[PDB]
Amino acid sequence: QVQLVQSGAEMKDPGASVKVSCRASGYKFTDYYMHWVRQAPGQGLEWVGWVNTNGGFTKYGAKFQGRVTVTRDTSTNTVFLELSRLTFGDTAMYFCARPMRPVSHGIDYSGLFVFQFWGRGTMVTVSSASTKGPSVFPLAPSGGTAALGCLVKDYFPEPVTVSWNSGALTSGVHTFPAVLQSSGLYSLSSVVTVPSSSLGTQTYICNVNHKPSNTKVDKKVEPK
Amino acid sequence: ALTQPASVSASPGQSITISCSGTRSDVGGYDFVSWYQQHPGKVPKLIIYEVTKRPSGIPQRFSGSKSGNTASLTISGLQADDEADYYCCSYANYDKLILGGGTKLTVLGQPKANPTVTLFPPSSEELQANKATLVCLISDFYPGAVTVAWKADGSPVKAGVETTKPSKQSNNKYAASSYLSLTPEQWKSHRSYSCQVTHEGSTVEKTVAP
């Protein structure tokens, strides 16, 4: 019967601000605090802060001091999370979560220190206002196997395709998901596991294509 | 803030235990440890609180304990649906909540496979552009989760690291990658850099130098 309903995903420029909403129902609103918990893509849960809905008192996590402001509207049972001066590091799912019991002020705070009911989360994506082509660097090789590859560094936006030897080479090829970096740019690598004995006689070339920047690169990857 | 293993696994019907190590300021100082289950792409779910208690609806085969600065979650009678990421959480001095980095629980489909690790040096092409990236490749492993720790001449490096979520290879084993950003001066000046990879059944540390 407890429900927490959050506003929709947001896309923002660096430096912008955003306000996420969380609508509570199925309990007496001011009897409970509300938490905000975030999760950057592929990362762990992080506590952002709490608000006492009775009165509005707030506390924030260490890395979230200042650029985060949590409020509520008791007349509409709504809790808000505002993020100002957005950075690429702020890209994350933001969840509101209700603790399990009212706090007894000056007596018992045990009720506060859990996330019992969760909203579905609101994605905030801080997106690079740019197009950059990648630099392509060889990953030089050297159980009878060896790995080699190409590092496709600092590009935006997605995607980048990578083939090997004009598509001829498939076995042992692995192309990773891109990593979002603090700069707002992506990097990825593509590797291939090959017989060690093929090094120095077989030729390995990665074919990289980043269409948004019209970057097409064929990089020969030679042993050290 | 709290330390958990990257992954744990076992067969259907068996049991696993997930550790959560902290300090006197948090896990060791209070009985305010909670655990959360997150099924892929779903909302986290409270499963344990106050070290040992369970909210309503969570079966008895989920249990929690603590000894000193380490809390543990134990799940017995493992089922396929238990496959999920698990996070521990604790109150900490002062007026904060801190969480572990998460643990992937795999209900084994196949026997475990040890990772093979390759550490690539910066290329001369990157170096001549006044930059340097070490690339740690982790290949052919199962269950699909690892911890990657970077070291400079034996000591920890936390700045300039990015790591991919494990991905699935064509041959259905798992791979991961990690990237350490350095200056060319750091690369040329240290005796060595290393990538240390911790997987469920083995640890591998690879070292590279100019």
Residue numbers in the entry:
A (entry chain H): 1 to 52, 52A, 53 to 82, 82A, 82B, 82C, 83 to 100, 100A, ...
B (entry chain L): 3 to 9, 11 to 27, 27A, 27B, 27C, 28 to 95, 95A, 96 to 106, ...
What do the authors of the reporting publication say about this deposited model?
The complementarity-determining regions (CDRs) of the two Fabs are in very similar conformations with Cα root mean squared deviation of 0.58 Å for the variable regions, suggesting that the two Fabs likely interact with Env in a similar manner. Of the two Fabs, 3BC315 bound the BG505 SOSIP.664 trimer produced in 293F cells with higher occupancy than 3BC176. Hence, the 3BC315 Fab: BG505 SOSIP.664293F complex was chosen for cryo-EM structure determination. The 3BC315 Fab crystal structure was then docked into the EM reconstruction to identify elements involved in its interaction with gp41. The majority of possible contacts map to gp41 HR2, with potential interactions between gp120 and the C-terminus of the adjacent gp41 protomer. While some minor clashes were apparent between 3BC315 and HR2, the paratope of the Fab has high shape complementarity to the pre-fusion conformation of gp41, and is not compatible with gp41 in the six-helical bundle post-fusion conformation. Some significant hydrophobic interactions were observed, such as the hydrophobic region formed by aromatic residues of CDRL1 and CDRH3, and I100c in CDRH3, which inserts into a hydrophobic gp41–gp41 interprotomer region. In our model, CDRH3 is in close proximity to W623. Nevertheless, in accord with the neutralization assay data for 3BC176, the W623A substitution abolished binding by 3BC315. On the basis of our modelling of this complex, the 3BC315 recognizes Env mainly via hydrophobic interactions and shape complementarity in a quaternary-dependent manner.
Two moderately broad and potent, clonally related monoclonal antibodies isolated from a single donor, 3BC176 and 3BC315, recognize a glycan-independent epitope that was proposed to be located in the vicinity of the V3 loop and CD4-induced (CD4i) site5. Structural analyses of the 3BC315 and 3BC176 fragment antigen binding (Fab) by X-ray crystallography, and in complexes with BG505 SOSIP.664 by single-particle cryo-electron microscopy (cryo-EM), reveal that the 3BC315 and 3BC176 epitopes are very similar and situated at the interface between two gp41 subunits. To study the paratopes of 3BC315 and 3BC176, their corresponding Fabs were crystallized and their structures were determined to 1.95 and 1.89 Å resolution, respectively. Like many HIV-1 bnAbs, the 3BC315 and 3BC176 Fabs have long CDRH3s, both being 19 residues, in comparison to the average human CDRH3 length of ∼15 residues25.
